[PDB]
Amino acid sequence: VSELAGHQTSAESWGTGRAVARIPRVRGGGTHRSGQGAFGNMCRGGRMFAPTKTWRRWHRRVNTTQKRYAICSALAASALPALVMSKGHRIEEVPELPLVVEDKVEGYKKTKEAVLLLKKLKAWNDIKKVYASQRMRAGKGKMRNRRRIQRRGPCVIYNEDNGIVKAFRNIPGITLLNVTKLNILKLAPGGHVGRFCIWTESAFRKLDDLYGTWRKAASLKSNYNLPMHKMLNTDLSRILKSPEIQRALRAPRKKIH
Amino acid sequence: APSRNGMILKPHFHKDWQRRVATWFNQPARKIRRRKARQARARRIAPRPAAGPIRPIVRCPTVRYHTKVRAGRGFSLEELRVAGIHKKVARTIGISVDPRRRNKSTESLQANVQRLKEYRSKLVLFPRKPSAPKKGDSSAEELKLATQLTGPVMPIRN
Amino acid sequence: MKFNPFVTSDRSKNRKRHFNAPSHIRRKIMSSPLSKELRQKYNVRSMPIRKDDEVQVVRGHYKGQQIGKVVQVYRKKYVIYIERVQREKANGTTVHVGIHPSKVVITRLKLDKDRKKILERKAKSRQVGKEKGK
RNA sequence: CGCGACCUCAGAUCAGACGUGGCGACCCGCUGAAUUUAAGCAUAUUAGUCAGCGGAGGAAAAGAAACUAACCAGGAUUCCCUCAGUAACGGCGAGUGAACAGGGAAGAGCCCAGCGCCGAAUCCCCGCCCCGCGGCGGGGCGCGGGAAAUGUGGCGUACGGAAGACCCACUCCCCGGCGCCGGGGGGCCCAAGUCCUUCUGAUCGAGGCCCAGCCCGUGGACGGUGUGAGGCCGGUAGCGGCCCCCGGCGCGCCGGGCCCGGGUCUUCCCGGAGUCGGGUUGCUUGGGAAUGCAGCCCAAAGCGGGUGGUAAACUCCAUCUAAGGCUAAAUACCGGCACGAGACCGAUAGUCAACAAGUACCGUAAGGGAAAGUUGAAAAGAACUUUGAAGAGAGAGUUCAAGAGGGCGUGAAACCGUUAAGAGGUAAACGGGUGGGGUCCGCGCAGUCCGCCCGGAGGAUUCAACCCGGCGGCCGGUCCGGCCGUGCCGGCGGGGCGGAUCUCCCGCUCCCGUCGGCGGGGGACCGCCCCCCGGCCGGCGACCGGCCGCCGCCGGGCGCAUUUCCACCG
RNA sequence: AGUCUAACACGUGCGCGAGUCGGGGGCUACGAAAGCCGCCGUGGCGCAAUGAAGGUGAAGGCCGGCGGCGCCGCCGGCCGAGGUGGGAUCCCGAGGCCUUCCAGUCCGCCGAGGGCGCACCACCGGCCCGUCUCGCCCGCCGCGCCGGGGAGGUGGAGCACG
RNA sequence: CGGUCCUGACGUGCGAAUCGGUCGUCCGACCUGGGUAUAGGGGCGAAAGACUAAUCGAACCAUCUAGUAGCUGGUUCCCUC
RNA sequence: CGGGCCCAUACCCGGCCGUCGCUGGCAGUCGGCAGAGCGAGAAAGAGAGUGGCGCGGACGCUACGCCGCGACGAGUAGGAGGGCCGCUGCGGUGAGCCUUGAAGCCUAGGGCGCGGGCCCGGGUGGAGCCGCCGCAGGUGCAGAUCUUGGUGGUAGUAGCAAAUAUUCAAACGAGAACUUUGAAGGCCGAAGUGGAGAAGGGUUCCAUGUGAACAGCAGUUGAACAUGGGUCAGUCGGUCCUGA
RNA sequence: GACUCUUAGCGGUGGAUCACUCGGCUCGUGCGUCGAUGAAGAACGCAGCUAGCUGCGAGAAUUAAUGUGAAUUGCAGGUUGAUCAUCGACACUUCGAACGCACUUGCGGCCCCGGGUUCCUCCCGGGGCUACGCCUGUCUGAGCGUCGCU
Ligand SMILES: [Mg+2]
Ligand SMILES: [Mg+2]
Ligand SMILES: [Mg+2]
Ligand SMILES: [Mg+2]
Ligand SMILES: [Mg+2]
Ligand SMILES: [Mg+2]
Ligand SMILES: [Mg+2]
Ligand SMILES: [Mg+2]
Ligand SMILES: [Mg+2]
Ligand SMILES: [Mg+2]
Ligand SMILES: [Mg+2]
Ligand SMILES: [Mg+2]
Ligand SMILES: [Mg+2]
Ligand SMILES: [Mg+2]
Ligand SMILES: [Mg+2]
Ligand SMILES: [Mg+2]
Ligand SMILES: [Mg+2]
Ligand SMILES: [Mg+2]
Ligand SMILES: [Mg+2]
Ligand SMILES: [Mg+2]
Ligand SMILES: [Mg+2]
Ligand SMILES: [Mg+2]
Ligand SMILES: [Mg+2]
Ligand SMILES: [Mg+2]
Ligand SMILES: [Mg+2]
Ligand SMILES: [Mg+2]
Ligand SMILES: [Mg+2]
Ligand SMILES: [Mg+2]
Ligand SMILES: [Mg+2]
Ligand SMILES: [Mg+2]
Ligand SMILES: [Mg+2]
Ligand SMILES: [Mg+2]
Ligand SMILES: [Mg+2]
Ligand SMILES: [Mg+2]
Ligand SMILES: [Mg+2]
Ligand SMILES: [Mg+2]
Ligand SMILES: [Mg+2]
Ligand SMILES: [Mg+2]
Ligand SMILES: [Mg+2]
Ligand SMILES: [Mg+2]
Ligand SMILES: [Mg+2]
Ligand SMILES: [Mg+2]
Ligand SMILES: [Mg+2]
Ligand SMILES: [Mg+2]
Ligand SMILES: [Mg+2]
Ligand SMILES: [Mg+2]
Ligand SMILES: [Mg+2]
Ligand SMILES: [Mg+2]
Ligand SMILES: [Mg+2]
Ligand SMILES: [Mg+2]
Ligand SMILES: [Mg+2]
Ligand SMILES: [Mg+2]
Ligand SMILES: [Mg+2]
Ligand SMILES: [Mg+2]
Ligand SMILES: [Mg+2]
């Protein structure tokens, strides 16, 4: 709010006596705005309780190590059909979830042939879901250039540009991404993991070099290696019903008394 | 009023500090403007090094840093007259000069003389009238190959 | 998506500009599509409406297939009047009902030198655009 | 006495110029409080801050050491990080409080006076002629007039300079005009459904448009149009088009200024005074036996002078050269001209001001200062009949809606009128428990069903088994073939990365083609990783192919009715 | 009508870890976002304390001999980074857990008694800096108002495998 | 021109000081219009701390200022321990 | 002094709700490839080996889940936990809702929750709205002689009482206590309730028309409202002079 | 039956809520421009019917020119370019630093024109000048200021 908002007037309290409530009153004058009440959050006009300031801490700071951790986690989640379908993508007819296409796709220049590529890959149902999801936002956001809303669709990752963004940018819900500049804001929209991804062969090959392997550290990072696992075998049922463990237990008590 | 075990503090907020609060919301805009001006200057000075003139080897002053070298203001007049370059020609051909610098030992002087000789063997000179070459001017074979270099001209590494 | 950093997506700014446009911009806003036959024979999709063009009404209570001649173009209220699109008042006077030019299709243009110049300019622009595209 | 010079000083409506005042967000120079904190209060703090005065610009100010340092030294100014809440200051209380070095953004240096040497070699103005002319300039001509020797111009400034001599080298600089070669402001333009049917007062709604899943898409931002539109309109994308005007980077031409350098040796030359510094007083600073500034008094020197954070004498070093001047960039911006955006407010909010808002109004004046948005898609804003003087009604009509009738979207509460019901001498009202009556609900009014079996009536492509074909699940103690390892061992293999692990040549400098030094390139070794080959371990339950075996399911036959299944009845 | 900014303290969650952090700078519609830099880690905090300051700056013992029993140095070699008590857990195991009865084999379990002891707690020793007392030895480019060392008390926001 | 007494009227009045009767002076230190001078820690005062635009034992206007208050008033949903 | 009797939220038995504790139980749903168990006073095996037809078996386990045993339940100032309590905006999600009707509003309608509150039905209304996972905040009122706006009882009440006073007839007019005309009776009484100016007001002055609003009753009237008109200088004054 | 209370329906008063938004607030970008050649600000006037707001200046809701190309509109009126936008030519009332002296809009002076005169003076109208400080140059001067000649 304006720093001088609610302080334009010259007003002083009427003091004790005169059967008024000791709030400041506007000074004199033959008008309705006269002896009415000027300063204070409870008065009509005048300042509010704690006027907002521009030097509120707007931005935040996150460590690079855990930013890269989050990117790795999002990429790992984006390769599980259960997680992708839970996020809601219509990937049922998709041949293989880490969808990789050849490098000829990166040379497309027509939205028509991009649409044909999507139809052949059988990812068109997700864009049709986006079309269904296009509706009008609720609340006072319409008056602030946030009138229309829609669902996020599949994400395209390219190694380098030869018209791929020109071809795909018109289609709704498609997010074009450089492999070397992945951001969690577009990889994991809304704070949830498992966005449907379409890769190109060159970007898919380069990703390994980008983030390093378990044995080989990342070469395009000055010093980075993949985060480790606190527990390896996550198949809890398999662990529980194994001979070595099942041997060393006491007999269960399931007699309700 | 202090309460229990704490650390008593002295905040310097007793002046009219809210009247002077310099925010940094225009920081990305300033970075963009600086980079754009940098590119404009680099493209304006077409073949010359983008990082301006060469600069000499300098020891840091105090005992805390006197084991490190860095880039100084300009070459000293003793270094110029030992290298053979003229005071008023060095700046034209792209060498930083300052008449303030003294030379208290021969090692720094010789290191800077060798650096000047390397730079002088390294640069390429253009004919200010292209249709007429001159004596110390280079030939078209390297005139075709001349290009700008990024960063400092001859990096100073200890 | 709009990429030009010098035009607004601001709803308020667009509304203010539209409702405060001067007359020579009102003329550009008041454009109607030519019929199928005229569009085919001129390679031009739309033409700002004029005072004496034969038109049809495509939407509303007065929609039909009758050919009506424009009477006046009332740029202040963003409506145009046609020669037989009118209702009956209480006393017995017939007044015209305004219709927006975007809901009206032009049937026969009023040709003069400047109108012909506009048509040939638009045709040349579409021809060069098609040559570039193909 | 008169006349003529110079010097100081006057009057001009003399010829030609210049200043004044405004805004003031940012900047420069003065002046300068008190609320407040110290739990009182006087030093201190608030605070060199508000108020007051003066002066500018597109930025201002500062700025090329009378510097920092004490190191193997750095090197104009300005800004950012850090130094650092540190050294220091403080009724040593409350509180206050820098700088150096380091890393960066930017990066550019110069000019006088003085000492000297050049026949004042210098500048301004009036008149003619030629050209240029909306930044009053270039050239030729005047026995034209002034300024200036009480000092103009050239060379020259602390980084040394000048002159002479001896060697080497050079004819690539700039401008006044002309002509030619390819970012800014403006204007006009450039894709595709009003397709079929069906909702509505009105469609922009809903369904469809095949095997080209209607059409365009480098255009699916937005706004308008009778709700809710990528394709109706303006627009949006495009190194898309055309048409106007302006600048720079280049080109040759005509003319103009200037005939310009470096190295060595020698001889000469070399600096800013009521200023520095000292005493005292007052303010100021973190600056403390005085950081900076100012007043008064004293008042310099030239191997001098200042500084070297504790006063003073002596003695050595280090470091600059004050008392004259100019200078872009990085930097600041709540005013102004245009803009773009927002996890902001949504008419008691957001600016006081969404509207004829600094307005109406109030005060003698300085000044104070509001309330106030919404008919409908379109006025289609109610013709006409009738009672009344009329406001105002009853009919008629528009509209989808007057249940939208000109302060008219929706229309709550307080408060009021009327209708219906109930009740009424301890003010009303309230909690617990019942009873009575109402308005409504159950669309209650013949009451639940769901499986197995027995019996009675019926009807089927109809069960089991078998054959063919397809798919799937589990296996082969130890089927054949693959892939993978946060697996390993082999290698007379081929490499990329790294090492504060070693050691052939090149560049630099130190020597009378040489001994020996430094930097760099070349190779060895070690460690990691990728790839080609081989051999074992494990996995394929985050990671399988074929064959065989069993089982399961499905489709089709063959089965034809004591089987199986459908619907009724007791 | 308990808000925002800054500081601090503790408690919780996350990443890395004796290290950690680019926040300033730089390179590449949403995007003023994001990604990257390592000879951009300058720097901050931590890895060392103590003294006003000049300064100093965190284990010892044994074996055998020479000299001035023991102690010191030349030596060589070896052990080598505390102890006591309580300590969750872990380790060993006198014997034993039946289907007729005997013997003995493998797996598993229970258990008298006995141990190696995490973290932490108490106590006792030890080491570093300041200070005090008592004392004699050692070194040399400068033999000195030089430098170094020991024994015993005591002061510290210390060390004692981060 | 002024304002004694009725301590009368009125006292949400005719009036934020008015009304009635009764009263003081009425050639003077007299009453009065316009012009003019004196401005806030100042003026001016036959002096009551009187007057200085309904405000005077320090006017009024804006700002410093959202001045401080160990002191009054208020402080917004539920359940569970 | 004796028997009997009456009742508190106390005590006993029983049901239900929550909290605490057992840091209790359950991965064993191991099914024709099968063999149903771990609750019972007293440690530890439904231990392994070596020699003497018919194709069948309920629910369960959002493990942040479900289930079982006991005990316990006051509360201001204050602390903490849980909210599938509530409000506004943002990122994801609901192939969500919506002109065959959104928000909002009213409701003697049906219900759910201990509660905060919520969901349906009816009416009105006419264009947008919501559920779940996270994020953010100018986020919840009965009070502050609180601010702004509106409305009550008082209440058709107090009041429309300073200065002597009205009456008859007619005219216009829809309408006359108040307008006008005529007549009568009165007052101011020449220091006036008269005739004219200065300061100040600024069109109030004049004619016509109207009677929405105003003139504290009414008005045919007005200093109201709307149309139009009106201020004439050498000799009135400013202009000129000087005074404090 | 009156009056009073509660409840509901309807109708009043009132403008809450909801939905709208040519308005603000905040951030960022580019530019970063007043005046004696008369600024900011004030006053008064201008439309066929016009009060306020807006625009304009006796050429007064605008002229000229360029671009666009058939309107403005509440009511009248009469394409060889209506209306808009741009804006480079022209024009721009009285005050205001405000400039002849004062601030009534009062009083002048000098010069040149047309009426008068037939310049002979008056008088009328019009036009151009008539401020302070200051720089350079010019003209006219002053001084028992320093001199030189006679
Ligand atoms: Mg406000
Ligand atoms: Mg809402
Ligand atoms: Mg406390
Ligand atoms: Mg564009
Ligand atoms: Mg003159
Ligand atoms: Mg000025
Ligand atoms: Mg105090
Ligand atoms: Mg106090
Ligand atoms: Mg006090
Ligand atoms: Mg003080
Ligand atoms: Mg101070
Ligand atoms: Mg100030
Ligand atoms: Mg300016
Ligand atoms: Mg400057
Ligand atoms: Mg200098
Ligand atoms: Mg620190
Ligand atoms: Mg200070
Ligand atoms: Mg520095
Ligand atoms: Mg730089
Ligand atoms: Mg000179
Ligand atoms: Mg629309
Ligand atoms: Mg459709
Ligand atoms: Mg459409
Ligand atoms: Mg649209
Ligand atoms: Mg179009
Ligand atoms: Mg278009
Ligand atoms: Mg001070
Ligand atoms: Mg100087
Ligand atoms: Mg200087
Ligand atoms: Mg943006
Ligand atoms: Mg309102
Ligand atoms: Mg408001
Ligand atoms: Mg409202
Ligand atoms: Mg509201
Ligand atoms: Mg309204
Ligand atoms: Mg509307
Ligand atoms: Mg309706
Ligand atoms: Mg309505
Ligand atoms: Mg309404
Ligand atoms: Mg009622
Ligand atoms: Mg009744
Ligand atoms: Mg802590
Ligand atoms: Mg009295
Ligand atoms: Mg009385
Ligand atoms: Mg009374
Ligand atoms: Mg005085
Ligand atoms: Mg008196
Ligand atoms: Mg007294
Ligand atoms: Mg005072
Ligand atoms: Mg206050
Ligand atoms: Mg107290
Ligand atoms: Mg019980
Ligand atoms: Mg109890
Ligand atoms: Mg309790
Ligand atoms: Mg609507």
Ligand SMILES: [Mg+2]
């Ligand atoms: Mg908010």
Ligand SMILES: [Mg+2]
């Ligand atoms: Mg309330």
Ligand SMILES: [Mg+2]
């Ligand atoms: Mg009465």
Ligand SMILES: [Mg+2]
């Ligand atoms: Mg009366």
Ligand SMILES: [Mg+2]
């Ligand atoms: Mg009388």
Ligand SMILES: [Mg+2]
């Ligand atoms: Mg009279």
Ligand SMILES: [Mg+2]
């Ligand atoms: Mg009179």
Ligand SMILES: [Mg+2]
């Ligand atoms: Mg009259």
Ligand SMILES: [Mg+2]
């Ligand atoms: Mg009346």
Ligand SMILES: [Mg+2]
């Ligand atoms: Mg006369």
Ligand SMILES: [Mg+2]
């Ligand atoms: Mg006079």
Ligand SMILES: [Mg+2]
């Ligand atoms: Mg009710």
Ligand SMILES: [Mg+2]
């Ligand atoms: Mg209202």
Ligand SMILES: [Mg+2]
């Ligand atoms: Mg309304």
Ligand SMILES: [Mg+2]
């Ligand atoms: Mg007018």
Ligand SMILES: [Mg+2]
């Ligand atoms: Mg014109």
